[PDB]
Amino acid sequence: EMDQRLGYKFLVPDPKAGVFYRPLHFQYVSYSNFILHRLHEILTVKRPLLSFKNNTERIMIEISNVKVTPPDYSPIIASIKGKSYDALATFTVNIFKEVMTKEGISITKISSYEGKDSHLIKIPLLIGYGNKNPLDTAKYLVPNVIGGVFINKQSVEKVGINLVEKITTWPKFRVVKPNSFTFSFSSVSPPNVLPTRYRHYKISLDISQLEALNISSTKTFITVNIVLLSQYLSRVSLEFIRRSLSYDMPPEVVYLVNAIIDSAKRITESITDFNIDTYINDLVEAEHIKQKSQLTINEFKYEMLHNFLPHMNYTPDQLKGFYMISLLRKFLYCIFHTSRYPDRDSMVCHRILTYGKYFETLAHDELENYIGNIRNDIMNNHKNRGTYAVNIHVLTTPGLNHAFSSLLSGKFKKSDGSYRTHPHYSWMQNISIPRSVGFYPVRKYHPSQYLYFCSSDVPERGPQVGLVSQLSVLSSITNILTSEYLDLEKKICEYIRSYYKDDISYFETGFPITIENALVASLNPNMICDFVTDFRRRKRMGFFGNLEVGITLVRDHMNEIRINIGAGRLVRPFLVVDNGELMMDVCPELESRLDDMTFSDIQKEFPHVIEMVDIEQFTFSNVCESVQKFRMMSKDERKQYDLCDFPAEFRDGYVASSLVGINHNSGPRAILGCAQAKQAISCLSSDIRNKIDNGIHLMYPERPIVISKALETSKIAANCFGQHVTIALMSYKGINQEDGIIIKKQFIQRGGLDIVTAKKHQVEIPLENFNNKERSNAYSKLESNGLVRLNAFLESGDAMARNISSSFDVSEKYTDMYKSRVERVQVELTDKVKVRVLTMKERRPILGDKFTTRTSQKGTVAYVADETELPYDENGITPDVIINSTSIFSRKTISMLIEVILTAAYSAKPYNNKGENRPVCFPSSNETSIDTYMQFAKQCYEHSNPKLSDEELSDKIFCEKILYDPETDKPYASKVFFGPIYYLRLRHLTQDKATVRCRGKKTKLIRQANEGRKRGGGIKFGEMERDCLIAHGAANTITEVLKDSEEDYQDVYVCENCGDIAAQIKGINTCLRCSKLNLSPLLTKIDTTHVSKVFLTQMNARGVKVKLDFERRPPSFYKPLDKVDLKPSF
Amino acid sequence: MIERFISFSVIVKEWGMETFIEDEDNIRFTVYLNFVEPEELNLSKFMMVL
Amino acid sequence: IKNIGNTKSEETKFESKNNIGIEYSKDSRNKLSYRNKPSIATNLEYKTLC
């Protein structure tokens, strides 16, 4: 059970490391890194804009003095007053020309601007833990607040998710067509290079044309044979490359290798006196002439061949050539063994964007647009005018404001889901949403998602099915600053070059070593294992100054060593296995010292017990699934493993940690349970009486006592999401069928599962209308000041504020079928009048309201039964809720029975041997035997009543009782499952869905009933309902349903000649078109819909003439008919 | 199968075939070949597609 | 066995070391129009070949 305790140690706070709330910690830091450090680096620039003469006459733009300050009011004040919560950033800009002189540097100012006192930049600020932001270093925390939200201009709370980056860390393979393949990859500059440079390359291979094995891009690089390019970069022979590409390959790949090399040699020999430099130069010049570049040939060539690989800038060329060779090797291997190469949907080849990265990218893009606009304006001014004058109004709008506002509005590049308005359904949502990860449109459950994302928490319907995942409680996403990045990279490179001096220059048969995909050396194969082991050891001791460095050893036949340090990687802790020895089992002091140590203390004082591992390293390792399974293996078997995993309860997310024993039920039920856990009503907010917002609040909350540790550390348990009620599993007169339930009247009367719904109303009124002096029947709740009275109840026709247009009332109206009480009123007076109102209503359960358990057994109230009508036990107890028993066993929700048993056991003995309140641990992904739980319950009951017979004790353990019919007072045939359980109320209420329409408004174009529940719209009679009516054979009924109302009839005449609707002039029906042509056609009455007339007129507008004829059947007469019998002859 | 492939190949110049019984449970088909120019490139292509 | 051929006319899943040759054999451009007779002598211990 030591592994469980070590796991628990990660979930609790770690003050020594600055972790005050683990679940959201990685998000806090993500934002803190942007606002405090990265923004300054992005803005502080000093760059040329234009150059003249020859590198001796250039305009320069500089930005400095960046300052950021927080607001002067708390977020609650911002909510009440209707303000926004933004930090203010200011900076100074200088534009000046510089002329290079032999005497030194000559400086001549042109323009300068400052934003010392102005809203130069407004940056939305993250509320954070305890309503505390990173700018304000106060010393007061609001309890039970975790934050993670923004407040926008209109005073609306916003919350966001994480997003998978578009750029991959592994090349993508694709079969263009039979025997024709491609291999595409990308290169990006390191973090400390501003602005960032990007390059995208594609390698094409076709079996029919092996001379055209070409690497290409779009308007940034030449199209050249990759083998010849490698020769040019590395200055090595073709035989060297042949030997390299086939050193440790299966024989079927060597044939393709030989064919490629021979094709390259043929190209080389096809030219007279071949020279590689001349070949490359000719290609470059041909590209130069093909494009209309105005640069000199030398400039074009230097630009092309110096920015070839941005991620490997400032390295010799031979390393670039060897990098190309390794890419080709992987390409060929993937050609012959595709299923063994990382797939494009694998998590191995992706990284994830957190809160701060959105802001960082937007700042980058906006700064670049700003500088570009300044350059264009200066160039235009020089072209038209002289002196190089910089226009004003182009250096005062950096454009960050609209970028950030749009970001919060829910738009981000080609995505539209990064941020959204916070739905205030439950407290736990503040954890659930910021820990979500979204993928671009893949819906299958890929194996690489396991153990880092929750298995059961995914959308169950809609367009997002299989596109949103939830982090496990032990997973995190990495952060790192630029200076830390540089220091770490330097230390790693120094270690490599110092401790392996003589064996890092193989380049033909060795394993290349890359850092962030940048090749830095090539290791002797015989020493791969040692290098990795010694590396990991030094990683765990803090030798490199960072414990989250990832190292991967790829060996199938691709033969690579990869090192990863960048931000956006998924990481988890694992137990270390060293030389077939579980370190946790050889550290006796740890067991005694654990209780007094934090997680970082364990890492510092007992290294080699736990290691932080990222997903790519995990995917290529050998990991034992459990400590128990490890202990059952022989030593030789143990020697094959690198890591050991923690128990399964740590593989669920925080939402799924609200459920109990999900691995004892069917999986679909787990998906449903995760879905409905977020809709349970809870203690939503400490500011119930202050915040002017929508919400639903639980009235007399109870803390669950059959729980998991994660539910306790996250504080979801402390904020409550249900109540303990007494249930019976039986059939009640055949009423509770198909998921209907029985509920007790007196339980409802006393406050059982009572809630309060709160709603926000907002209006804007012109000042004249508000002050207008005339009592309409809709103003009965108003005071003399024109505002609704406090504590009054509003009805479905009342107005909240006086709004008269001048002698007509034009105010908005309350439109709910239930009344509500006025809790708060806030008014702002300006050119207009803005009124905000908060109302509340308590809602005791009624017929149709929805409930559920923690095992996904949901139902609606089917009958409210009086206490005297319910069955009772020998102690006089009647159940609060009755649920039909069959559904428990047809859906296989076994853990519900175990939960009831344990809740009863706790009720019998709720305290420790020390007398302290003792919760019972029943985690999701349980792992504890049912017999052990039964023994625990038996001990509880034996402590309660020492003198019980065997039958009574068995009945108590199994929660079985004899119940009596209240009408006759006689027992039922057999005993009934009966006991307490934590029960949840869901947000679906009957009176929020009921609708009815008698008559109302119509749409103008087609003159049919309007749409909208709040606007009194009508229900739509669709065409499938029409199909059903036709299937019944009810022709008149469907005809009357589809026609216009009989009360809207009017006389309409149509011309039988041209089909136009006849006009009526001076009471005479006339066809204008035909009259103009001197014709006298017949006009006939029609009875059709308005929409038909609109459709026909539009068709006429498109040039199609529609003419109608009419039936003039000759008159018919009835004739007597002879009689017919039709009966048989019997 | 082997003979029909080799006979109509556009990259084979001269060829001959023979068959041997290695033992009670193995058969050896031997092919003698000379390819068209270029030689080694066509050799690799042939070994790849055979 | 009689001459039954193939042309580029349901999806298949071959081992990809055979798929290269299989898809190569589907192109009529890779076959000679007339059979190329053997030219390297073999099976010298038999007259049934004649």
Ligand SMILES: [Zn+2]
């Ligand atoms: Zn007419």
